[PDB]
Amino acid sequence: AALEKEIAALEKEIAALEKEISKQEKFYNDTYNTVCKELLRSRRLENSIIEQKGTMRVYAYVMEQNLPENLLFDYENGVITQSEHVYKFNRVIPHLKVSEDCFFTQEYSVYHDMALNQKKNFNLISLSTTPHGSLRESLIKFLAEKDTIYQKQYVITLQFVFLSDDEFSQDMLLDLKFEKHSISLDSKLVIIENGLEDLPLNFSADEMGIIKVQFFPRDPVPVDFYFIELNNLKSIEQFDKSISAETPIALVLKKLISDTKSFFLLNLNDSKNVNKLLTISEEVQTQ
Amino acid sequence: IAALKEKIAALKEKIAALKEKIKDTELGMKELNEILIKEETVRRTLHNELQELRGNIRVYLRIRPALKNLENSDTSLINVNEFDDNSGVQSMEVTKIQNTAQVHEFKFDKIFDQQDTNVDVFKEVGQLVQSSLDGYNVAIFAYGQTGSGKTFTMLNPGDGIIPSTISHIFNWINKLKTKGWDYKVNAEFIEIYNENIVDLLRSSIGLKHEIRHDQETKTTTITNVTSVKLESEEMVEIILKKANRTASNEHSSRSHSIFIIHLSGSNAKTGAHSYGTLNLVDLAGSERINVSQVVGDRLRETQNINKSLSALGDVIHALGQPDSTKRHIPFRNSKLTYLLQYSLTGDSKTLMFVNISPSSSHINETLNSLRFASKVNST
Ligand SMILES: Nc1ncnc2c1ncn2[C@@H]1O[C@H](COP(=O)(O)OP(=O)(O)O)[C@@H](O)[C@H]1O
Ligand SMILES: [Mg+2]
């Protein structure tokens, strides 16, 4: 039984290699976790710097699968270069290295925790030229899944509506008054306890939309979060609006930009309409 | 049997698959570690930017708890306002109630009140210790009348600024080891009394201790002063105790004590080096002494202390002005400011702690300390 003896010798070598792998995994996991923690240490400093300077938050989220070679991305310095034009950002985020779930935990959570802890009403304004719902999907998972820290100390509520020009406008959950310094809505009010399960099947679909999220502290005044999406070229064109009109779309935009903490995100996807997104990000910071 | 022959092939294939997994994981870890090493450099840059924005010169007021029954229990003369998040300033007032109320208003970067502990204080100081580790010079001063809490703030066992600083230093050095950084920590502990330097780490009378500046490296040495390598928290605790603050504490209250820590870092993986000096100063009591019926030695001691403290105020005031490079700053006038000059200029960070009593018993001296605090405020 020479072949059976060789199997024993090969099984012994597999056992020795697998033991080495198991040990290696422990070290790898420690280093991997440290990297994630250290990156967040940087983001906390970055956030503290933004607060000191009082500048507006404008971030870029880059999918470089089908984009022109002319457009160059500096993920370390927050710069997009065309042509000698340089577009400045707080951070330029690579989609290849950072997923939608990772965006919220690594790149967004510092901002989120800050605004929520100092009871400041805040928002996330996401701009894109291609409709994609995996970002909105990740937001809900991050905020209102069963086991999140936000579900632990807050009761979480959601309202999802879509405003169109002009003028209506419908509820996105089925089938507005401006009080003090927050936007109240007369729509369907849904309490989330288990994440996307409490929302309809058409919620994360299609991979101006407004999501209003309220945070009621457990043991009186609810903290408001607003999630704005512009899906395509036409939607972002209305966002420009001579820095012209009084459409309900612009009426809530002006309210949030002046009365709440803003977070601007540019989702660069298609190669056809990159330049228009880049121009408006420059227009947001200067105005 | 072909079944066994096919089994061997699958095992030999699995061997090559597992060996490649090991090699890939080694490569991944190598890449993760380069991110860690790079991120430490990024952190230093970001941290310093934040420190600049928060001010290279900062003034903190600290009101210690009232002491029964060594002073009046009445603390009503002082009102502390909330920290203004918008302006980054925290204000307070001293009021004497009469027909026309005597009001004095003062503004600080932060005010610590009776309930604020040494742990609370260090939440703010830790970032400056970090600057020193990152390769910047830092000077932290405790100012105020004898009895106001300068020594407690600096040296209370476990949680004083100095013990908290040592802990931060060694914990951070330990963390940095895994990122290619090697650190050498050396310290001096000196006293300035009547413009003379005494070595508090000596292990005697006729010894000369003179300030020597090296303009090229912007470093300073004192002749014949003991320098000790700091190896652990426990080792420093032993060294601190031996050097320590009735005759002894009277002398200590009439002199400046300065703990000087040099943090020398080198990274063999990146070729980076960093060198920062941290200066922790427990100043001579600022109280105004009635010198009328006093003896000559006491008079001159009072004059020197006033001269030294006034020069420190003059120097820091000047450094906080927009026209700092244009105007002349005379460090040379006083031994304390001359000694510390390289830790007060350039990218250096300065923190002035002004300690006060909350008691009505000390209101006049408190107002002096608050006026000194207003002078050292930057623009
Ligand atoms: N923050 C504080 N908390 C509690 N006790 C304090 C505090 N600061 C000072 N003390 C006490 O007040 C007294 C005088 O403090 P000390 O540090 O000797 O003042 P100084 O060094 O300014 O003369 C001491 O008994 C000290 O324990
Ligand atoms: Mg003392």
Q: What are phi and psi of A63, to 5 degrees?
A: -100, 100
Contacts of B1 in chain A (CB under 8 A): 3
Nearest-angstrom CA–CA distance, B151 and B248: 13
Nearest-angstrom CA–CA distance, B62 and B149: 9
Burial class (CB in 10 A: 0-12, 13-18, 19+), A123: buried
- CA B225 vs CA A262, B188, B216: distances in Å: 56, 7, 21
Ligand 1 contact via B65 beta carbon (within 6 Å):
yes
Resolution in A, one decimal? 2.3
Ligand 1 contact via B147 beta carbon (within 6 Å):
yes
Task: Give chain A as a 3 state SS string.
Answer: CHHHHHHHHHHHHHHHHHHHHHHHHHHHHHHHHHHHHHHHHHHHHHHHHHHHHCCCEEEEEECCCCCCCCCEEECCCCEEECCCCEEECCEEEECCCCCHHHHHHHHHHHHHHHHHHCCCCEEEEEEECCCCCHHHHHHHHHHHCCCCHHHHHEEEEEEEEECCCCCCCEECCCCCEEECCEEECCCCCEEECCHHHHCCCCCCCCCCEEEEEEEEECCCCCEEEEEEEECCHHHHHHHHCCCCCCCHHHHHHHHHHHHCECEEEEEECCCCCHHHHHHHHHHHHHC
CA of B203 to the centre of ligand 2 (A): 23
Domain count, chain B: 1
Which atom of ligand 1 is the closest one to the Cα of B62? 1
Nearest-angstrom CA–CA distance, A32 and B174: 19
- Which-ligand-closest: CA of B255? 2
Which residues are registered as beta bridge partners of B353?
Answer: B60, B142
Q: What are phi and psi of B72, to 5 degrees?
A: -60, 135
Closest-CA residue of chain A to B2 = A3
* Cβ–Cβ below 8 Å for B8 and A3: yes
The letter for the amino acid at A227 is: F
Closest-CA residue of chain A to B47 = A45
Q: Is B58 annotated as a binding residue?
A: yes
Q: How many CB atoms lie within 10 A of CB B146?
A: 16
β pairing state of A263-268 and A122-128: parallel
Q: Is B327 annotated as a binding residue?
A: no
Structure tokens, B301: 């001691």
Q: Is B148 annotated as a binding residue?
A: yes
Nearest-angstrom CA–CA distance, A204 and B174: 46
- Which-ligand-closest: CA of B144? 1
Which atom of ligand 1 is the closest one to the Cα of B144? 22
- Reduced to 3 states, what is the DSSP secondary structure of residue B105? strand
Which of B30, B42, B134, B175 to substitute to test the interface with A, most A CBs within 10 Å? Answer: B42
Q: What are phi and psi of A197, to 5 degrees?
A: -65, -35
Distance from the A152 Cα atom to the nearest Cα atom in chain B, whole angstroms: 27
- Reduced to 3 states, what is the DSSP secondary structure of residue B348? coil
Ligand 1 contact via B286 beta carbon (within 6 Å):
no
Nearest-angstrom CA–CA distance, B40 and B37: 6
DSSP label at residue B144: S
Burial class (CB in 10 A: 0-12, 13-18, 19+), B375: middle
* Cβ–Cβ below 8 Å for B22 and A24: yes
The residue numbers preceding gaps of C to N over 2.5 A in chain A are 82, 175, 207, 219, 243
Ligand 1 contact via B126 beta carbon (within 6 Å):
no
Structure tokens, A96: 């290849």
β pairing state of B181-193 and B228-229: antiparallel
Ligand 1 contact via B256 beta carbon (within 6 Å):
no
Domain positions in chain A: 1-287
CATH number at residue B360: 3.40.850.10
C-beta separation of B350 from B51 below 8 A? no
Long-range interactions of B201-208: CB distance < 8 A, separation 24+: B201/B225, B201/B226, B201/B227, B201/B228, B201/B239, B201/B243, B202/B226
CA of A122 to the centre of ligand 1 (A): 44
**CATH number assigned to the domain covering A1-287:** 3.40.850.20
Residue nearest to atom 8 of ligand 1 (CA): B149
Nearest-angstrom CA–CA distance, B224 and B208: 7
CA of B245 to the centre of ligand 2 (A): 6
The residue numbers preceding gaps of C to N over 2.5 A in chain B are 203, 244, 245
- Helices in chain B by DSSP H: which ranges? 2-54, 118-133, 150-155, 161-177, 233-243, 247-253, 296-319, 335-339, 363-376
CA of A100 to the centre of ligand 2 (A): 56
The letter for the amino acid at A2 is: A
Which residues are registered as beta bridge partners of B110?
Answer: B60
Calculate the CA B311 to chain-centre distance. 20
Q: How many CB atoms lie within 10 A of CB B174?
A: 10
Which atom of ligand 1 is the closest one to the Cα of B355? 22
Structure tokens, B75: 């603390």
* Cβ–Cβ below 8 Å for A7 and B15: no
Nearest-angstrom CA–CA distance, B46 and A41: 10
Distance from the A100 Cα atom to the nearest Cα atom in chain B, whole angstroms: 21
Residue nearest to atom 19 of ligand 1 (CA): B149
C-beta separation of B104 from B92 below 8 A? no
Q: To test ligand 1's pocket by mutation, which of B62, B152, B281 has the most ligand atoms within 8 angstroms of CB?
A: B152
- Interface residue B27 vs chain A (CB under 8 A): no
C-beta separation of B169 from B261 below 8 A? yes
The letter for the amino acid at B99 is: N
β pairing state of A177-179 and A182-184: antiparallel
Nearest-angstrom CA–CA distance, B356 and B358: 6
Closest-CA residue of chain A to B54 = A52
First and final C-alpha spacing in chain A: 83
Which residues are registered as beta bridge partners of A158?
Answer: A190, A213
Closest-CA residue of chain B to A34 = B36
Nearest-angstrom CA–CA distance, A209 and A162: 4
Which atom of ligand 1 is the closest one to the Cα of B118? 1
Which of B1, B11, B86 to substitute to test the interface with A, most A CBs within 10 Å? Answer: B11
Q: What are phi and psi of B57, to 5 degrees?
A: -125, 120
Long-range interactions of B78-82: CB distance < 8 A, separation 24+: B78/B358, B78/B366, B80/B111, B80/B113
State the Cα torsion A209-A215-A216-A218 to the nearest 10°. 150
Nearest-angstrom CA–CA distance, B300 and B285: 15
- Sheet with A72-74: strands ordered across: A72-74, A79-81, A86-88
Distance from the B184 Cα atom to the nearest Cα atom in chain A, whole angstroms: 24
Kind and range of the H or E run holding B112: strand B110-112
Q: Which of B19, B33, B88 sits opposite A17 (nearest CB)?
A: B19
